[PDB]
Design a protein around this ligand. Structure first.
Ligand SMILES: [Fe+2]
Ligand SMILES: [Fe+2]
Lengths: 370, 371
């Protein structure tokens, strides 16, 4: 295949430059890399590759990838190709992918607008095949720049895969029957649509409220606070799906079931031996809802209470009341108050200054191997 | 099918009924009913250790202590362990039972590096002990939460043999230069079990040595990088003993050295998802220190152990001990910050997250091998 020849050429160069990450911004390296890219019989003739070669050859005087990002942001085609350095996506160096876009609801894209691209990866180099790489952000390029209107990509096929591997088995085992009826047996296109709604609502709400990111990002990287921010925007997404009447009723309920099931189940067991950021926040949600009448435990199984929408509003309101005090107190004091809220509903070890999976989800992890 | 399998069936069934009652595990109303159920169990209730627990549980309201059970266990009246457990890092354990077999020990090792350590294989056990998380059992894991300096500490060597077979061997083949661990190459389970038992005996002994031993300084060594650094301090101490103590059999000591080194350099280095755990942070500190100070070399992504590695290991231990020695003239909090500074020089510490990332070398190995 012609695209398969291109990607085979990318993987071979990637293999040659692995172990050269310390010189990814050194011009002698970039000059050589650019030359090998230009001479690749198939890769080198791609328009996106013309752009990268140009950016790299000019990097000594202009350290950014403007021609590459212009191509990508303008969607000149559906190929992405660049040199990457994202510490949380370590598999990414020289990488290539082709994507396909997904259907989009007009009201959703208009009322909750953001430069979000929910896409499926069709083909890709080796670095993009890691299960860790679920998205691609503009600062992940070696230049490290992000602008408000740079496109952000979410690889929806990977979230479908995660839903079918973890969430479904968790729904069967942990939820009371009838908890997520639209999700039962739903095909991959159905899950795809719901996941695409989730990422659009997610990125939009990151920018809303009194401590939005990127502005307050450096105050929201502590494990419990990073998770809480992810939870804040997804609870907002859930409530949008429940409350905004201009969204199609069937797709809106489906997306609500998706976001809630992901936040309640899949995210709640992430991380070994300790919960990661998302899991701490999901365990905060679990215990908050239990204590405030939004869910109930019957026979080791979770029942969703009819009052759940009101308890979700209560929970988001609570987060927003803490964040609102940024106007009258320091960011550090809000941090302490968000931490104090989290620790009331999670298993925090004050000597380790870290968290343990609450027993409910520790048992589930043991039972299901998740 | 087995009298022990009948006993365990009773424990497992009693375990199931009291799951969901952990908050009542010290409530005397619960304890009377648990004790009564244990006493009335047809096979379990006959056991001396079960009579000891019933006695302990019935008196808990006035003496919250499992003295009779622990006396039985610490005196090795038989090879059975049975108690009610509450260990936050071993969440599978509630009412549990196991039978063990001890392992042979080198006499010089056991005398010169003495500690109340019991390297054992689990023969049969209740469900809680079957979790791969449960690799050991400490005295404070019982509901009474007490540990005495001479309480026996158990390590389940069969699970460490399992982990070495499933992870370490695969990492040796893929990551080390050939010839790196010649004695461990194709060693049978009996051989690995022997080295592992040496590892745990030296490990527990050295925990108690130095200027900031545990348990005395335990609450200063629970932060992730410091907890890992303390595991690494005692295991490097163990490596050096195997290389330097001439009264240990040479063949067995080198095998044990290979085992401790391979475990710390490889298996522990990849622990934790998405971030390294305590052990992995310290193991990556060791990797980078050794790389930068001439103890190992990387050639095309494969590790070569330098002949100078004994001297670099001594230098590394000497450096930890220089930092810890200042406990005598500064606060434990000041020593903590210097241990952190030392660690962060050689690990990938994200200062905004206040946590660590797997260094790229081991991040790629996790991706490649699924470890
Ligand atoms: Fe996010
Ligand atoms: Fe230890």
């Amino acid at each position: 295949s012609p695209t398969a020849a291109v990607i085979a050429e990318v993987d071979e160069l990637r293999e040659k430059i692995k172990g050269s990450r310390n010189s990814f911004r050194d011009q002698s390296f970039l000059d050589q890399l650019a030359q090998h890219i230009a001479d690749a019989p198939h890769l080198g003739r791609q328009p996106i590759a013309r752009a990268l070669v140009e950016d790299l050859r000019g990097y000594a005087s202009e350290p950014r990838l403007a021609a590459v990002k212009a191509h990508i942001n303008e969607e000149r085609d559906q190929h992405i190709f660049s040199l990457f350095d994202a510490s949380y996506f370590p598999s990414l160096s020289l990488e290539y992918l082709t994507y396909e876009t997904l259907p989009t609801n007009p009201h959703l894209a208009a009322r909750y607008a953001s430069p979000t691209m929910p896409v499926n990866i069709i083909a890709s180099s080796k670095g993009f095949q890691s299960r860790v790489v679920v998205a691609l952000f503009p600062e992940n390029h070696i230049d490290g720049i992000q602008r408000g209107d740079d496109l952000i990509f979410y690889f929806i096929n990977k979230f479908v895969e995660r839903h079918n591997r973890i969430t479904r088995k968790m729904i069967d085992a942990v939820m009371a029957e009838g908890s997520f009826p639209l999700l039962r047996g739903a095909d991959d296109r159905t899950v795809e649509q719901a996941s695409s709604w989730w990422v659009r609502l997610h990125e939009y709400h990151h920018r809303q409220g009194d401590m939005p990111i990127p502005e307050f990002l450096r105050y929201k990287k502590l494990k419990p606070l990073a998770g809480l921010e992810e939870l804040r925007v997804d609870v907002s997404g859930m409530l949008v799906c429940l409350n905004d009447p201009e969204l199609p009723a069937d797709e809106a309920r489906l997306a609500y079931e998706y976001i809630l099931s992901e936040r309640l189940l899949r995210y709640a067991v992430e991380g070994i031996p300790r919960p990661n950021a998302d899991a701490v926040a999901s365990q905060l949600l679990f215990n908050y809802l239990s204590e405030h009448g939004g869910i109930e435990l019957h026979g080791g199984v979770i029942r969703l209470c009819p009052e759940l929408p009101a308890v979700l509003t209560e929970f988001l309101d609570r987060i927003q009341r803490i964040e609102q005090r940024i106007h009258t107190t320091s960011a550090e004091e809000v941090q302490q108050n968000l931490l104090e809220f989290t620790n009331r509903y999670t298993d925090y070890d004050p000597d380790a200054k870290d968290y343990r999976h609450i027993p409910f989800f520790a048992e589930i992890k043991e039972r299901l191997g998740v």
